Short mmCIF file of all heavy atoms in Angstrom, two decimals:
data_model
loop_
_atom_site.label_atom_id
_atom_site.label_comp_id
_atom_site.label_asym_id
_atom_site.label_seq_id
_atom_site.Cartn_x
_atom_site.Cartn_y
_atom_site.Cartn_z
N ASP W 1 0.83 -1.19 0.00
CA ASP W 1 0.00 0.00 0.00
C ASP W 1 0.87 1.25 0.00
O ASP W 1 2.10 1.19 0.10
CB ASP W 1 -0.94 0.00 1.21
CG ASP W 1 -1.84 -1.22 1.25
OD1 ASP W 1 -2.90 -1.20 0.59
OD2 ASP W 1 -1.48 -2.20 1.95
N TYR W 2 0.21 2.40 -0.11
CA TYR W 2 0.89 3.68 -0.13
C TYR W 2 1.10 4.20 1.29
O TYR W 2 0.29 3.94 2.19
CB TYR W 2 0.10 4.71 -0.94
CG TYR W 2 0.01 4.37 -2.41
CD1 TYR W 2 -1.03 3.61 -2.91
CD2 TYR W 2 0.98 4.83 -3.31
CE1 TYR W 2 -1.11 3.30 -4.26
CE2 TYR W 2 0.90 4.53 -4.65
CZ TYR W 2 -0.14 3.77 -5.12
OH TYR W 2 -0.22 3.47 -6.47
N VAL W 3 2.19 4.93 1.48
CA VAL W 3 2.54 5.49 2.79
C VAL W 3 3.29 6.80 2.57
O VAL W 3 4.09 6.92 1.63
CB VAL W 3 3.37 4.50 3.63
CG1 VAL W 3 4.57 4.00 2.83
CG2 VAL W 3 3.83 5.15 4.93
N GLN W 4 3.03 7.77 3.43
CA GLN W 4 3.67 9.08 3.35
C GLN W 4 5.04 8.99 4.01
O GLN W 4 5.16 8.99 5.24
CB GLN W 4 2.81 10.15 4.01
CG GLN W 4 1.37 10.17 3.51
CD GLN W 4 0.83 11.58 3.36
OE1 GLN W 4 1.32 12.52 3.98
NE2 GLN W 4 -0.20 11.73 2.53
N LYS W 5 6.09 8.89 3.19
CA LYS W 5 7.44 8.79 3.72
C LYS W 5 7.91 10.14 4.25
O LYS W 5 7.48 11.20 3.79
CB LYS W 5 8.40 8.30 2.63
CG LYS W 5 9.76 7.88 3.15
CD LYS W 5 10.49 7.00 2.16
CE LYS W 5 11.83 6.52 2.70
NZ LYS W 5 12.90 7.54 2.52
N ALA W 6 8.81 10.09 5.23
CA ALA W 6 9.35 11.29 5.85
C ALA W 6 10.58 11.77 5.09
O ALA W 6 11.27 11.00 4.42
CB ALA W 6 9.72 11.02 7.31
N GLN W 7 10.84 13.07 5.20
CA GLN W 7 11.98 13.70 4.55
C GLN W 7 12.62 14.70 5.50
O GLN W 7 11.92 15.44 6.19
CB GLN W 7 11.56 14.41 3.25
CG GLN W 7 11.10 13.46 2.15
CD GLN W 7 12.25 12.68 1.53
OE1 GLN W 7 12.83 13.11 0.53
NE2 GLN W 7 12.58 11.54 2.12
N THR W 8 13.95 14.72 5.52
CA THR W 8 14.70 15.61 6.39
C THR W 8 15.05 16.90 5.65
O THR W 8 14.73 17.08 4.47
CB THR W 8 15.96 14.91 6.91
OG1 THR W 8 16.64 14.28 5.82
CG2 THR W 8 15.60 13.86 7.95
N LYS W 9 15.72 17.81 6.36
CA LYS W 9 16.11 19.08 5.75
C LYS W 9 17.08 18.85 4.59
O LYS W 9 16.89 19.37 3.49
CB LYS W 9 16.73 19.99 6.80
CG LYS W 9 17.15 21.36 6.28
CD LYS W 9 17.70 22.24 7.39
CE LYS W 9 18.31 23.52 6.84
NZ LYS W 9 19.60 23.27 6.15
N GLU W 10 18.15 18.09 4.84
CA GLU W 10 19.11 17.81 3.78
C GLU W 10 18.46 17.04 2.64
O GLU W 10 18.74 17.31 1.46
CB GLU W 10 20.30 17.02 4.35
CG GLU W 10 21.29 17.87 5.14
CD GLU W 10 20.77 18.25 6.51
OE1 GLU W 10 19.88 17.53 7.03
OE2 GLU W 10 21.25 19.25 7.08
N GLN W 11 17.60 16.07 2.96
CA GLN W 11 16.91 15.32 1.92
C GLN W 11 16.01 16.23 1.09
O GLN W 11 15.96 16.12 -0.14
CB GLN W 11 16.11 14.18 2.54
CG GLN W 11 16.95 13.02 3.03
CD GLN W 11 16.13 11.96 3.75
OE1 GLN W 11 15.69 12.16 4.88
NE2 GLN W 11 15.92 10.83 3.09
N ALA W 12 15.29 17.14 1.75
CA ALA W 12 14.42 18.06 1.02
C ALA W 12 15.23 18.98 0.13
O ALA W 12 14.84 19.25 -1.02
CB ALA W 12 13.57 18.87 2.00
N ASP W 13 16.37 19.48 0.63
CA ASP W 13 17.21 20.34 -0.19
C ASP W 13 17.76 19.59 -1.40
O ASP W 13 17.78 20.13 -2.51
CB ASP W 13 18.36 20.90 0.66
CG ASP W 13 17.91 22.00 1.60
OD1 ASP W 13 16.98 22.76 1.23
OD2 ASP W 13 18.48 22.11 2.70
N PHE W 14 18.20 18.35 -1.19
CA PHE W 14 18.70 17.55 -2.31
C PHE W 14 17.60 17.28 -3.33
O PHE W 14 17.85 17.31 -4.54
CB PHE W 14 19.30 16.24 -1.79
CG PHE W 14 19.52 15.22 -2.86
CD1 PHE W 14 20.58 15.33 -3.74
CD2 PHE W 14 18.66 14.13 -2.99
CE1 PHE W 14 20.78 14.39 -4.73
CE2 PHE W 14 18.86 13.19 -3.97
CZ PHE W 14 19.93 13.31 -4.84
N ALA W 15 16.39 17.01 -2.85
CA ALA W 15 15.27 16.77 -3.77
C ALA W 15 14.95 18.03 -4.57
O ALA W 15 14.69 17.96 -5.78
CB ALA W 15 14.05 16.30 -3.00
N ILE W 16 14.97 19.19 -3.92
CA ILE W 16 14.71 20.44 -4.63
C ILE W 16 15.79 20.69 -5.67
O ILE W 16 15.50 21.11 -6.80
CB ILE W 16 14.62 21.61 -3.63
CG1 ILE W 16 13.29 21.55 -2.86
CG2 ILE W 16 14.76 22.95 -4.35
CD1 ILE W 16 12.10 22.10 -3.63
N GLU W 17 17.05 20.44 -5.31
CA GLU W 17 18.14 20.63 -6.27
C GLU W 17 18.00 19.69 -7.46
O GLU W 17 18.19 20.10 -8.61
CB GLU W 17 19.49 20.41 -5.58
CG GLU W 17 19.89 21.53 -4.64
CD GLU W 17 21.23 21.29 -3.98
OE1 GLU W 17 21.86 20.25 -4.27
OE2 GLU W 17 21.66 22.15 -3.17
N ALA W 18 17.66 18.43 -7.21
CA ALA W 18 17.48 17.48 -8.30
C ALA W 18 16.31 17.88 -9.19
O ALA W 18 16.39 17.76 -10.42
CB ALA W 18 17.27 16.07 -7.74
N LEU W 19 15.22 18.36 -8.59
CA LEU W 19 14.08 18.80 -9.38
C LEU W 19 14.44 19.99 -10.25
O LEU W 19 14.07 20.04 -11.43
CB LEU W 19 12.91 19.15 -8.45
CG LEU W 19 12.18 17.96 -7.81
CD1 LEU W 19 11.31 18.43 -6.66
CD2 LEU W 19 11.35 17.22 -8.85
N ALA W 20 15.18 20.95 -9.70
CA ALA W 20 15.60 22.10 -10.49
C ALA W 20 16.52 21.68 -11.63
O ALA W 20 16.40 22.17 -12.76
CB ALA W 20 16.30 23.13 -9.60
N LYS W 21 17.45 20.76 -11.35
CA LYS W 21 18.35 20.27 -12.39
C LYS W 21 17.57 19.58 -13.50
O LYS W 21 17.84 19.81 -14.69
CB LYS W 21 19.39 19.33 -11.79
CG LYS W 21 20.47 20.02 -10.98
CD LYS W 21 21.53 19.04 -10.51
CE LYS W 21 20.99 18.08 -9.47
NZ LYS W 21 22.08 17.31 -8.80
N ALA W 22 16.61 18.73 -13.14
CA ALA W 22 15.82 18.04 -14.15
C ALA W 22 14.98 19.02 -14.96
O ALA W 22 14.84 18.86 -16.17
CB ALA W 22 14.92 16.99 -13.48
N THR W 23 14.42 20.04 -14.30
CA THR W 23 13.64 21.04 -15.02
C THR W 23 14.51 21.79 -16.02
O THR W 23 14.11 22.02 -17.16
CB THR W 23 12.99 22.01 -14.03
OG1 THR W 23 12.27 21.27 -13.04
CG2 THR W 23 12.04 22.95 -14.76
N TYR W 24 15.72 22.19 -15.60
CA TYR W 24 16.61 22.90 -16.51
C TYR W 24 17.03 22.01 -17.67
O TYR W 24 17.11 22.46 -18.82
CB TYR W 24 17.83 23.41 -15.75
CG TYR W 24 18.48 24.61 -16.40
CD1 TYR W 24 18.04 25.90 -16.12
CD2 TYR W 24 19.54 24.46 -17.29
CE1 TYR W 24 18.63 27.00 -16.71
CE2 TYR W 24 20.13 25.56 -17.89
CZ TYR W 24 19.67 26.83 -17.59
OH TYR W 24 20.26 27.92 -18.18
N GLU W 25 17.31 20.73 -17.39
CA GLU W 25 17.68 19.81 -18.46
C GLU W 25 16.54 19.63 -19.45
O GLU W 25 16.77 19.62 -20.67
CB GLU W 25 18.10 18.47 -17.87
CG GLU W 25 18.88 17.58 -18.83
CD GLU W 25 18.37 16.15 -18.84
OE1 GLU W 25 18.13 15.59 -17.75
OE2 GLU W 25 18.22 15.58 -19.95
N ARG W 26 15.31 19.50 -18.95
CA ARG W 26 14.17 19.35 -19.85
C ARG W 26 13.95 20.62 -20.67
O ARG W 26 13.61 20.54 -21.86
CB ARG W 26 12.92 19.01 -19.04
CG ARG W 26 12.93 17.61 -18.45
CD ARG W 26 11.78 17.40 -17.48
NE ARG W 26 11.63 16.00 -17.10
CZ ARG W 26 11.14 15.06 -17.89
NH1 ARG W 26 10.73 15.33 -19.12
NH2 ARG W 26 11.05 13.81 -17.44
N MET W 27 14.13 21.79 -20.06
CA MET W 27 14.00 23.03 -20.80
C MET W 27 15.04 23.13 -21.91
O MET W 27 14.73 23.52 -23.04
CB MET W 27 14.12 24.23 -19.85
CG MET W 27 13.32 25.44 -20.29
SD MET W 27 14.04 27.00 -19.72
CE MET W 27 15.47 27.12 -20.80
#
């Protein structure tokens, strides 16, 4: 089943950075 996984400060920052990188690459 689905579950809401937890994320830390460093993990959230890394996820934001990866999302920005992927967005720039797609653009």
Side-chain angles (χ1 to χ4, degrees):
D1 302 276
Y2 294 90
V3 52
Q4 308 219 337
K5 192 162 183 277
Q7 293 287 267
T8 47
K9 181 177 172 288
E10 283 75 23
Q11 286 175 287
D13 285 327
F14 165 76
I16 286 280
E17 287 181 0
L19 286 165
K21 286 185 291 192
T23 308
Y24 205 86
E25 197 226 315
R26 290 171 169 287
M27 210 209 73

